[PDB]
Structures are given as structure tokens and as C-alpha cells.
Amino acid sequence: PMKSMSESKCYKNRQVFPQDTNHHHTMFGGTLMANIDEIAAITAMKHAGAQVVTASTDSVDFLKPIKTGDILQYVAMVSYAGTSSMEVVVQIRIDDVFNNKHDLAALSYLTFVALDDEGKPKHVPGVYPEDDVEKWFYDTAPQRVERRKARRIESKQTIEYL
Amino acid sequence: PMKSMSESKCYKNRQVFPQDTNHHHTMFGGTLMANIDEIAAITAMKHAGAQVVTASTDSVDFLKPIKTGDILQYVAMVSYAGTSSMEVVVQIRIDDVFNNKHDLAALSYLTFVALDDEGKPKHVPGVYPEDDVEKWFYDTAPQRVERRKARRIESKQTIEYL
Amino acid sequence: PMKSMSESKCYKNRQVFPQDTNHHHTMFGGTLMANIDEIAAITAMKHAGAQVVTASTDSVDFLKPIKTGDILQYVAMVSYAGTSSMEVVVQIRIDDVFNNKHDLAALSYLTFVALDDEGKPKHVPGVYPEDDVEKWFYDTAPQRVERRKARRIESKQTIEYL
Amino acid sequence: PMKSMSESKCYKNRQVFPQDTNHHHTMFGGTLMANIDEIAAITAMKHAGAQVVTASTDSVDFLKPIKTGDILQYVAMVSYAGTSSMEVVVQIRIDDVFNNKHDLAALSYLTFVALDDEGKPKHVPGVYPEDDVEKWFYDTAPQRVERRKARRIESKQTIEYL
Amino acid sequence: PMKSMSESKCYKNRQVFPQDTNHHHTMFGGTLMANIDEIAAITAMKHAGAQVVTASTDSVDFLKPIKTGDILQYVAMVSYAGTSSMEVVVQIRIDDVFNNKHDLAALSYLTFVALDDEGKPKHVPGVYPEDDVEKWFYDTAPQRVERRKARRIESKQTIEYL
Amino acid sequence: PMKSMSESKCYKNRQVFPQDTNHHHTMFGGTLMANIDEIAAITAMKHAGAQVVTASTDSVDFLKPIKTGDILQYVAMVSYAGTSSMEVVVQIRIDDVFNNKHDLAALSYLTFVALDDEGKPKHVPGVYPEDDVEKWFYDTAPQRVERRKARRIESKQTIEYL
């Protein structure tokens, strides 16, 4: 059983406030991160139809500065479905309502595991793309996943050492 | 010059945290109201393509209790365009991911005014609906706007009286 | 059993901080509304001697800009007591400490329902005014309250339609 | 020039929210202190008719545990006025709306200095009490003051040694 | 049984954001004080090996204005250990990463009580200094402690009187 | 010109409050990420002697659930110094004050760029280790850095495609 990438796609529009920025009037990367995780977890929950935990934040690329009073659009979707886990891709776009432009300011990939009521890993549906963008993320997912798996081994060695 | 109710339609998915509730495990009306104004302001900004100020909160109807760990979907859209003002309707739905339900937990109507860079009221485009929901809010708007107009008078008597 | 409007009258002085503003050094409507609901709920709790829930924000009129560094005075009173329900009026004034001026910057009306421990609507005492202002809010409340009940139906039609 | 203690007296009712507490459902002392400073600054601003800075927090005595859902009443008053400095006393009471009790749960004393537009210490009016409580705080100030002054010296020695 | 002042010494580095300041770009004393309590309570729990409550804040001396984007270093240590109580001294330094200077911007003394699982005062180990700074606060605490005991009674009289 | 890993090592002790958790009494990963980014940026600033921007979050591995009332220790250090960039490793430990344990709950790597006052990349000193843990992170840095640079390209393609 399969769900589309659109089915669980979640949106979030926010305006960037003074309490969201640093001393440079530039948005705190940590605030951006917290929003990213919030939206992504909702997307993962919707796709799995279950509670989720964040296993890892695989990367956040901060591509463009985000200023006070900028309007952000966050798009989260499942880009990959393993057995009990999913990759969620979050796009952060600066949304300019004055010239109707949308610039890509941040890109993030996270990994969530679905759980049952007892906290055991839960099977999830597979996922499929419908448009060219979803397809891009879906098609590039398999290399990211194999990297995540290799990086898990490095973290394991690190933990074993400490 | 006109826009659809869709072009400016904004979404927001948020789960309900402790810091968002009262001691009863139920969501504080204040937090809910703050989310409403934020989302609606973004919508009016998209529609007017201009800065906005909230002129009034026409109403907030709390129709169902909202609990910690509930998943919220806010939908904001412009339901009416006057000269320089917009009515924005916000629907707050309880989104159940375990049984794929959606319930209407609250309903809010706001009025925003568009402004130029000098803080003067700006002309806005008109609005039109495309589906039966958009059309229900679009069709029922004219009475609400007049009731809003009447109530501005009542506020005036009151300011004068004090 | 009856209480004066003064018996439950509550006050709140607060300064307006950067975290309460948007990009234009102007107070966020949503923040003002959260403060309004908080103060109103305390007043209704005092009047009912019971836990309360906010059934509706009947209106918030934003009349004057509220700026960073402004001192706000909120006054909350019960202007109407139905069987289980209270209308609360909240006045928000900008308090100028340099020329002892007070300006009405916002006006709000909210509806609370008092509950027993098990969550069932509880009977509240009646209310009465003692001065000219209190009398004004009191005398105008029944028309607002009849509008509130009528609006409830519109909301019901909307829920039914959706 | 002189003012009563009552002319600058400030009130604040707030409910204690989950976000204000620690793991034991108990109000974070830090929160309480932030509220103290806020209400005290407003009071001192009123008295001095100027911008103010917190010179010192002379004490905060935590006397009764404050719990989630509690209603707090803060009362701030100038209990002493030197040349450019004001002592503000804040009383924090737990306000029980179920039985009309008010227990003193905290007491605090702070020192503010009034500043002119350029940042120099600004003269403030004298202060005088009108009721027995006001007289109590007013008459006991001289010992808190000489305790403040001796302690400024100790701070100086500490800075010097470091 | 004993512990050095170092064993429980806690550090906290934070940058000063817009949300932490008032309208003068300058750190809200309240924010400063919330951070103080947070770090000091951690040190006290570490030293006691138990839950703690804040009994009082004995003083906060605001020595230097702290501006937006400044880097703060908080250091908390136990400077005195009664039977069940601890004086904790918190030092607040402005950390300049450009010229590797540190300025003392605030100094604070708090008093905590250790509690057993049942909420009763719990005996704590004594404390000893190892360096010249630790010795300075250690050697000076007894005079502060006696000032604190005296001041608790004062606070008692105030409660009785009111 | 070179700095030890210890020279810029920054600590943060924090306790996990109700407002930091989700409905399962478990710390929000978003909150943990904000904290991570803050401490790491300070470490970056210390090492670089300059302002910094967060270029990317390379990973966050969530290894153990973190619960309310837990005490956290964050440790941030520069593990790699490129020309204008730094890798910062943040360790998050659950600190048990009752049995003196420290458990590794999360590990993160982030990448910062040093800027001059005009926003151009700035040269940073090199870094070197002094103890076995520092040496472990330093010695594993080269492989992560090369992975960072391969992944940046993927992101370039993705940006191009979109």
C-alpha cells in the first residue's frame, strides 16, 4: 500500500519576527531548524498514520539569508519510505508577495521512525511521486539513504569510543 | 483586477504543545487567536500584495475543545474585498491522522486594511470563489461586512461616550 | 445572587517588548488578543467563582497603533451575566507616564461559560453596574448578547454546510 | 515635588501557565522574577515620569509555592525615593477565586534609577504613604536602604578583587 | 562530607537576542534574572545531589549595560553550605571574542534549600574553595548569610503585619 | 596560527522544562536543535574571533530520549578548521545528579563560516586537539568534511533543478 507524496504534504507560512532573528536582523538558524522539525513531524505522522520520532536530522542547507519581515513558506513531504522509517524533505522558500517570486532559502532532509502505541517500530506505506519536483526528490533519495546508513556506522563507532 | 480565493489561500499545520494550553489540558484561546491573526495576515498580504494591518477581529467561535497532542490545520482565505479592506476567514480544523478525519474546531473572521509604504490605505484587487466552500464563505460575506460596518459605529459611540 | 461589576474587575499593566512586535515596531494583533483573553478569563473566573472556557471572541477593535516601549493598561469587567455565561468587556489603553494621558487603543468583547468540576455549565451570579461607564457597558450588553446568540446559528449553518 | 505611593501603584493579574513552571508543576522562580521586574519598572517609570533602569534587585523572598493554574496578583509601589533612585516593593499574592482568599506568596524589593534622554541619573519626586500598609513599607525602608548601600560597597570590593 | 566549589560549578554561554531586550537594545533585567535562577538551581542540585527550591534571591547587582549580540558567560558555584541550604553566587560576564576581554556585568546571590523525595529539607555536604576567587566568595559568604537570615524574619513581620 | 579545541570549548547546562517537550513528555528535537545551533555558534565565534553564519547543519543524531526535568549538558568544540570555515561538534549529555552519570543523548555536527564586518569570508586559525576525545573528533573530521563537500554538490543540482 502506497500513498502519494501529495497526500501527506504539509505547508506552513510564517512571517519572520524580531524574536526570530539575531543581532544581524537575520533569522536564527536554530529557529529555522525548530520549524523544520515541527512541520516535518506532522508530514511523517500523516504519511505513517502513527506517532513518530525523529531518528536524525540528515542535513540542513542554509542557502539564502532570511531577514526580519520576510514571509517564509515551508513545504514538507515524504521523499522515501523504508520499512518503518521515512525520509522527509523540507523546502524553505522566501515568499515575496510584492513581485510574486519564490526563492529557495533552505533545504532539509530528516528521518523519522513510525511507532505503535507500545513504542515499537511500525510498518509504513510506500510512497510515490506525481509531479516532476516530487519525482526529483524521490529519484535522488536512494543515494541519500545509503549515505545515511554509512553515517550511522560512523556515529556508532563514535558512541562506542566515548 | 481580481484574484481567486485560492491564490492567497494559506495553510498552517501545528501540533498542540503544553506551552500552548491551560492547566485543563485544553488549548488556551489566546494562543489559538495568535495563530489566527498570524496566518490571516499572511493571506491578506498575499492578496493585497502589500503590508496590512488588522483593523478588527470580527469573531472567533470556539466550537470544539482542542487538546494537547491534537493536530491542527489552519486555512486562511480572503472571503471579501472592499476598496482597501479584506475579510479573511480562518478555519481551524482538528486533523486526525490515525483515522484520517477532519473536524471543524473553530471559525474566525478578521478585517485587514492594505497600506502603501507611507501608511496610507491601498486599493486591493477583488476576489472570486471557484469551489463550493469558497463560494459559501464568499456568498455569506456581504452580511458580515455590513454587520462589521454597523459595529464600527457602536465602537465609535463607546469611544465618544467614555 | 448578585455581584457588582467592580467585584471582578481586573487590571493588568504591561509594557510592549520587541518580542510582542512585528517588523514595523507595531504590536502584533495576536499578542494583544492573547493578553485580552488572559485578563478576561481571570475576571470571569472571579465573577463565576468557577473554572471558565472562552466560548467566543465577539469582537476586537484595533483603534490606535501600539508601539514598542508603550505601556498598556488592560481593564476587564463582566458586563452581562446570563444563566451560565458571562460577557466580558476588555479595554486596552495606552498609558502615557509623561503627560498622564490615557487613550483607548483597543476594545474587546468576549463570552465565557462557567463550568463545574465535571465540565458541565455552572450557574453564575447576576451582575450590576455602580457608575456611568459600567452602566454603559451593561446597558449595551443585551443587544450584543442577542447578536452573539444569532451568530451562533450562522456558525452552525456553516458547520452543517461544510 | 512629591507623590503618594498610590499615584504610581501598579497592578497585574496573571495566571500561571505550564510554560511558567518546572517539572514539579511549580512556578519557575525566574519567571516570577521577570514578572517582578516588569511591573516594578512600570511603577517606577510612573513615579519618575522618565525612562528607568534596574540598578539592583535587593531581594526576592519566595514564601509560598505557586502552582500551575493559580492566579497571581502583583502589586508594585514606590516605598522609598532618594535623589535619583526609587525603591519599588512588589507583593505577589495567590488569588483564590473559589474562596476569595489572598495569600502572600512572594515579596520583592528593587532599585531603579531614572535617566534623562542622554542617560544621566534624573531627579525623582519624593514619596509619601496614605494607608497603613503603605506606611509600613515606607517606615521600614531606612534599614533596607542602608543595607543596600553597604552592599554596593561589597560589590565594589568584589569587582576590585576580581 | 565535602565538595569543592568546582565540583558543582556550572557555566552557560548565551548570545543576547532581540527577544531578550527591552526597547533600548538593552537587556531586560528580568531575562537576566531568569537565566540566573536557571543556572544557579542547576549548580545547587549538583552540589546537593537532590531537588532544590529557591528560598530567596539575596541580591542582583546590575553593573554594566549588556547590549544586543553581546556574548554572556554565566558561572554559578556554591559559596556557602548550611545544614540544608546553599548560597549560590552567579557571575555574569560579558565575553568579547574580538579582544579576548571579559567584563563583569552582573553579580548575584541566591539561596536554595535541598529537599528529599517527600519535600522535606535534606542535609547537604559542606563546601570548600580551591582558588583565590572561590576563596573570596567563600570567605565573604558568612556575612551575607547572616544578612539573609535577618532579612527572612523581616519578611515574616511583613507577612504578619499584612 | 592555531588554537586548541579547548580554547573555544563552550558549555551549556540546561534543565528540560514543560514548554520544551511534546505530548509524550519527550523533548522536542526542534528545541534541542535551537539550543545546538546557539551554543555551536558561540564556539565558532570564539575560535574565529569574528561574526559567523551557520552554513549548514551536517547532522543531528538523536540517540536517547530526553525527558522533562532532565538536566542537559551541551559541549561545543571546533573539530575542523578550513580556510574560512569551521566544523563544530556538539555533544548533548543527560546529566544525572543523583548517581553522577552522563549519558550521550545526541550528537551534532555543524558548519560555520567566519565573516569580516562587510560579510566576506574571513580566515580562521587552525585547530589542534589535546586529549583523546578531542583527538577522536579531529581525526574523524577529514572524512566528514569530504562527505560535506560531495553533498553540497547534490544540493547544487537540486537548487538548479528546482
Q: Which domain holds residue D6?
A: 1-162
Those residues with Cβ within 8 angstroms of residue F3's Cβ, 6 or more apart along the chain or in another chain: F47, F78, F125, F126, F127, F128
* Residues C60 and D37 sit within 8 Å (Cβ to Cβ): no
> Which grid cell is B94?
482538528
Q: Does E41 touch chain F (CB under 8 A)?
A: yes
Q: Are F86 and F48 in contact (CB under 8 A)?
A: yes
Is residue F39 within 8 A of residue F10, CB to CB? The reply is yes
For residue F161, the SS3 value is helix
Establish if F160 touches chain A: CB-CB under 8 angstroms: no
Dihedral sign for Cα A7, A9, A13, A18, please. positive
Mapped onto helix, strand or coil, the DSSP state of residue C144 is helix
Domain count, chain C: 1
| Phi, psi (rounded to 5 degrees) for C81 | -125, 110
Contacts of F23 in chain B (CB under 8 A): 15-18, 68-69
Contacts of D41 (CB under 8 A, 6+ apart): C15, D52, D54, D112, E29
Dihedrals φ, ψ of B49, to 5°? 60, 50
B22 touches chain D (CB under 8 A): yes
Distance CA D107, CA D15 (A): 18
Contacting partners of chain B (3+ CB pairs under 8 A): A, C, D, F
Q: Round to whole Å and give the CA distance between B50 and B47.
A: 8
F72 membership: H or E segment, kind and range: strand F71-81
Note whether E57 and E110 are within 8 A (CB).
yes
Main-chain phi, psi angles of D116, to 5 degrees: -75, 175
Identify which of E15, E84, E7, E79 has the alpha carbon closest to the alpha carbon of residue E46: E7
Q: How was this structure determined?
A: X-ray
Query: Rounded to a whole number, what is the distance in Å from the CA of D162 to chain C's nearest CA?
Result: 34
Give bridge partners of residue D52 from the DSSP assignment: D114
Residue E27, strand partner residues: E21
Can you list the positions of beta strands (E) in chain E? 2-4, 10-15, 51-62, 71-81, 85-96, 101-115, 126-128
Strands A71-81 and A85-96: antiparallel
Selection from D81, E12, B101 nearest residue F72 by Cα: E12
Contacts of A73 (CB under 8 A, 6+ apart): A11, A12, A13, A91, A92, A93, A94, A95, A102
D15–B19 C-beta distance less than 8 A: no
Contact D71, D24 (CB under 8 A): no
C-alpha cell, A32 = 529555522
Tell me the C-alpha distance between F55 and A29, whole Å: 9
Q: Which of F22, C45, B136, D41 is nearest to A51 (CA)?
A: F22
End-to-end Cα distance, chain A: 42
CB F105 within 8 A of CB F61: no
Q: Which residues of chain A have a CB within 8 Å of the CB of E17?
A: 19, 21-23, 28
Q: b/e for B41-51, b at 16 or more Cβ within 10 A?
A: bbbbbbbbbbb
Interface touch C15/D42, C-beta < 8 Å? yes
Residue C145 near residue C22, CB atoms below 8 Å: no
Q: Quote the cell numbers at residue C57.
A: 471572541
d(CA F8, CA F47): 5
DSSP reduced 3-state for E32: helix
C27 touches chain A (CB under 8 A): no
Phi, psi (degrees; rounded to nearest 5) at B142: -55, -40
Rounded to the nearest angstrom, the minimum Cα separation between F125 and chain A is 24
Return all residues near A32 (Cβ < 8 A) that are at least 6 apart: A60, A62, A66, A92, A106
Q: How would you classify the pairing of strands A10-15 and E10-15?
A: unpaired
**Closest Cα to residue A93, out of A57, A54, A133, A132?**
A133
Distances from the Cα of D13 to the Cαs of C9, C11, C73, C85, D71, in angstroms? 11, 6, 12, 22, 7
CA distance D80 to C103: 30
- Structural element, H or E, at residue B113: strand B102-115
Are E113 and E45 spatial neighbours (Cβ–Cβ below 8 Å)?
Answer: no
**Rg of chain D (C-alpha set):** 17
Give the contacts of F18 (CB within 8 A, at least 6 positions apart).
Answer: B18, B19, D18, D19, D21, D22, D23, F68
User: Are D33 and E57 within 8 A, CB to CB?
Assistant: yes
CA nearest E151: which of C15, D59, D7? D59
Contact predicate F153/F146, CB 8 Å:
no
Q: Where are the beta strands (DSSP E) in chain C?
A: 2-4, 10-15, 51-62, 71-81, 85-96, 101-115, 126-128
Sole residue written with cell 534571591: E57
Judge contact between D137 and D83, C-beta under 8 A. Answer: no
CB atoms within 10 A of CB E59: 24
Resolution (A): 2.5
By C-alpha distance, which of D59, D33, D36, D45 is closest to D113? Answer: D45
- Residue A118 dihedral angles phi and psi, to the nearest 5°: -90, -5
Longest dimension (CA), chain B: 54
Q: Do chains E and A touch (3 or more CB pairs under 8 A)?
A: yes
Contact D28, E34 (CB under 8 A): yes
Distance from chain centroid for Cα D128: 17
- Smallest Cα–Cα separation from C49: which of D13, D20, D101? D101
Alpha helix positions (H), B7-99: 29-48
Tell how far CA E124 is from the center of its chain. 17
The C-alpha atoms of residue E66 and residue E30 are separated, in whole angstroms, by 13
In single-letter form, the type of residue at position A66 comes to: I
Best CA proximity match to E124, nearest among E43, E39, E38, E11: E43
- Give the long-range contacts of residues D90-96, CB within 8 A, separation 24 or more: D90/D36, D90/D39, D90/D40, D91/E162, D92/D32, D92/D35, D92/D36, D92/D66, D94/D64, D94/D66, D94/D70, D95/D13, D95/D70, D95/D71, D96/D71
- Alpha-carbon span E15 to F42, nearest angstrom: 7
Residue B18 DSSP one-character state: G
> What residues of B are in contact with residue C30 (Cβ under 8 Å)?
33-38
C-alpha D13/C-alpha D71 separation (Å) is 7
Query: End-to-end CA distance of chain E, in Å?
Result: 42
Collapsing DSSP to helix, strand or coil, F88 comes out as strand
Q: In a 3-state reduction of DSSP, which class is residue B104?
A: strand
What size, in residues, is chain A? 162
In this complex, the residue of E15, E18, E68 whose CB is nearest that of residue A19 is: E18
How many C-beta atoms surround the C-beta of residue E161 within 10 A? 11
Say whether residue F13 is in contact with chain E using an 8 A CB cutoff: yes
Q: What is the largest CA-CA distance in chain E?
A: 54
- Quote the DSSP letter at residue B48: H
Nearest residue to A25 (alpha-carbon basis) of A61, A62, A66, A60: A66
| Distance from C-alpha of E157 to C-alpha of C80, rounded to nearest angstrom | 42
Q: What are phi and psi of C3, to 5 degrees?
A: -125, 150
CA D70 and chain centroid, separation: 20
Q: Are strands D10-15 and A71-81 parallel, antiparallel or unpaired?
A: unpaired
CA distance F74 to C3: 55
Residue with cell 499545520: B13
User: C22 — contact with chain A (CB < 8 Å)?
Assistant: yes
The CATH number of the domain holding residue A145 is: 3.10.129.10
The answer to whether residue D119 neighbours chain B at the CB level (below 8 Å) is: no
Residue whose C-alpha cell is 512571517? A15
Grid cell, residue A3, equals 500513498
Distance CA A94, CA A103 (A): 5
**One-character DSSP codes across F115-130:** E-TTS-B----EEE--
Spatial distance between the Cα atoms of B27 and A102, rounded to a whole number of angstroms: 34
* 3-class secondary structure per residue, chain D: CEEECCCCCEEEEEECCHHHECCCCEECHHHHHHHHHHHHHHHHHHHHCCEEEEEEEEEEEECCCCECCCEEEEEEEEEEECCCEEEEEEEEEEEECCCCEEEEEEEEEEEEEEECCCCCECCCCEEECCCHHHHHHHHHHHHHHHHHHHHHHHHHHHHHHC
